[PDB]
Short mmCIF file of N, CA, C and O in Angstrom, two decimals:
data_model
loop_
_atom_site.label_atom_id
_atom_site.label_comp_id
_atom_site.label_asym_id
_atom_site.label_seq_id
_atom_site.Cartn_x
_atom_site.Cartn_y
_atom_site.Cartn_z
N UNK A 1 -4.93 10.55 15.47
CA UNK A 1 -5.54 12.19 16.09
C UNK A 1 -4.72 12.89 14.97
O UNK A 1 -5.49 13.46 14.51
N UNK A 2 -4.03 13.24 15.06
CA UNK A 2 -3.21 14.20 13.89
C UNK A 2 -2.49 13.31 12.95
O UNK A 2 -3.14 13.44 12.05
N UNK A 3 -1.81 12.42 13.58
CA UNK A 3 -0.87 11.66 11.97
C UNK A 3 -1.82 10.69 11.85
O UNK A 3 -1.46 9.50 12.84
N UNK A 4 -2.07 10.74 10.73
CA UNK A 4 -3.31 8.98 10.79
C UNK A 4 -2.97 7.42 9.49
O UNK A 4 -3.02 7.83 8.20
N UNK A 5 -2.32 7.13 10.36
CA UNK A 5 -1.74 5.70 9.10
C UNK A 5 -2.63 4.58 8.71
O UNK A 5 -3.18 3.66 9.05
N UNK A 6 -2.84 4.78 7.15
CA UNK A 6 -2.87 3.42 6.46
C UNK A 6 -2.76 2.68 6.24
O UNK A 6 -2.22 2.08 7.24
N UNK A 7 -2.86 2.05 5.33
CA UNK A 7 -2.00 0.79 4.68
C UNK A 7 -1.85 0.41 3.22
O UNK A 7 -2.63 -0.60 2.37
N UNK A 8 -1.36 1.07 2.66
CA UNK A 8 -1.50 1.66 1.30
C UNK A 8 -0.20 2.73 0.42
O UNK A 8 -0.25 3.67 1.03
N UNK A 9 0.70 1.76 -0.12
CA UNK A 9 1.62 2.67 -0.69
C UNK A 9 1.28 3.50 -2.11
O UNK A 9 1.55 4.66 -1.65
N UNK A 10 0.76 3.51 -3.39
CA UNK A 10 0.01 4.60 -4.49
C UNK A 10 -0.95 5.39 -3.61
O UNK A 10 -2.23 5.76 -4.40
N UNK A 11 -1.21 6.76 -3.01
CA UNK A 11 -2.28 6.51 -1.92
C UNK A 11 -2.20 8.01 -1.83
O UNK A 11 -2.27 8.92 -2.10
N UNK A 12 -2.99 8.32 -3.37
CA UNK A 12 -3.38 9.70 -4.43
C UNK A 12 -4.58 10.02 -3.76
O UNK A 12 -4.52 11.44 -2.60
N UNK A 13 -5.58 10.07 -3.37
CA UNK A 13 -7.21 10.71 -1.79
C UNK A 13 -5.91 10.72 -0.39
O UNK A 13 -6.35 11.89 -0.65
N UNK A 14 -5.52 9.86 0.04
CA UNK A 14 -4.31 10.59 1.18
C UNK A 14 -4.31 11.72 1.02
O UNK A 14 -4.54 12.59 1.79
N UNK A 15 -3.02 11.85 -0.29
CA UNK A 15 -2.01 12.78 -0.04
C UNK A 15 -2.15 14.20 -0.49
O UNK A 15 -2.89 14.76 0.35
N UNK A 16 -3.31 13.82 -1.47
CA UNK A 16 -4.61 14.72 -2.00
C UNK A 16 -5.68 15.59 -0.91
O UNK A 16 -5.19 16.90 -0.77
N UNK A 17 -6.28 15.11 0.13
CA UNK A 17 -6.27 16.10 1.48
C UNK A 17 -5.37 15.80 2.66
O UNK A 17 -5.71 17.89 2.83
N UNK A 18 -4.64 15.32 2.51
CA UNK A 18 -3.13 15.98 3.30
C UNK A 18 -2.29 17.22 3.05
O UNK A 18 -2.27 18.42 3.09
N UNK A 19 -2.40 17.51 1.32
CA UNK A 19 -1.95 18.81 0.64
C UNK A 19 -3.11 20.10 0.52
O UNK A 19 -3.18 20.93 1.23
N UNK A 20 -4.18 19.47 0.74
CA UNK A 20 -5.20 20.53 0.11
C UNK A 20 -5.96 21.22 1.75
O UNK A 20 -5.69 22.22 2.26
N UNK A 21 -5.48 20.01 2.99
CA UNK A 21 -5.54 21.44 4.19
C UNK A 21 -3.82 21.95 4.23
O UNK A 21 -3.68 22.85 4.70
N UNK A 22 -2.81 21.06 3.58
CA UNK A 22 -1.47 21.85 3.71
C UNK A 22 0.00 21.50 4.50
O UNK A 22 0.56 22.31 5.20
N UNK A 23 -0.23 20.15 5.12
CA UNK A 23 0.63 19.74 6.19
C UNK A 23 1.85 18.89 5.78
O UNK A 23 2.74 19.42 5.82
N UNK A 24 1.19 17.15 5.51
CA UNK A 24 2.47 16.42 5.45
C UNK A 24 2.31 15.70 4.73
O UNK A 24 1.42 14.09 5.48
N UNK A 25 2.94 14.76 3.80
CA UNK A 25 3.06 13.25 2.55
C UNK A 25 3.62 11.98 3.18
O UNK A 25 4.65 12.95 2.35
N UNK A 26 3.02 12.06 3.52
CA UNK A 26 3.77 10.33 3.96
C UNK A 26 3.04 8.99 3.31
O UNK A 26 2.93 7.94 4.17
N UNK A 27 3.51 8.73 2.30
CA UNK A 27 3.15 7.33 1.94
C UNK A 27 3.82 6.24 1.13
O UNK A 27 5.43 6.40 0.77
N UNK A 28 3.42 5.13 1.17
CA UNK A 28 4.43 3.84 1.37
C UNK A 28 6.07 3.67 1.98
O UNK A 28 6.72 3.29 1.71
N UNK A 29 5.65 4.13 3.22
CA UNK A 29 6.61 4.47 4.20
C UNK A 29 7.15 2.47 5.24
O UNK A 29 8.09 1.56 4.86
N UNK A 30 5.99 1.84 4.75
CA UNK A 30 6.21 0.32 4.72
C UNK A 30 4.66 -0.13 4.83
O UNK A 30 4.04 -0.58 5.54
N UNK A 31 3.96 0.24 3.75
CA UNK A 31 2.62 -0.52 2.88
C UNK A 31 1.76 1.09 4.02
O UNK A 31 1.52 -0.01 4.63
N UNK A 32 1.87 2.18 3.47
CA UNK A 32 1.27 2.89 4.98
C UNK A 32 1.38 4.15 4.14
O UNK A 32 1.83 4.63 4.02
N UNK A 33 -0.13 4.91 4.36
CA UNK A 33 -0.32 6.30 4.42
C UNK A 33 0.02 7.17 5.66
O UNK A 33 -1.49 7.07 6.22
N UNK A 34 0.94 7.69 6.00
CA UNK A 34 0.90 8.41 7.62
C UNK A 34 0.09 9.83 6.67
O UNK A 34 0.85 10.26 5.87
N UNK A 35 -1.15 10.24 6.78
CA UNK A 35 -1.56 11.66 6.27
C UNK A 35 -1.12 12.66 7.64
O UNK A 35 -2.06 12.48 8.52
N UNK A 36 -0.68 13.29 7.65
CA UNK A 36 -0.60 14.77 8.94
C UNK A 36 -1.68 15.40 8.45
O UNK A 36 -2.29 16.10 7.82
N UNK A 37 -2.97 15.79 9.69
CA UNK A 37 -4.63 15.35 9.22
C UNK A 37 -4.25 17.36 10.50
O UNK A 37 -4.44 18.45 10.32
#
């Protein structure tokens, strides 16, 4: 829905879409990119 958990540490495309919207960037939490979208 809002926060989307992936399976990736060095996640530049996940974090650049999350910062282009302007929200919050949570990569390498346990091999996981949580983008707030």
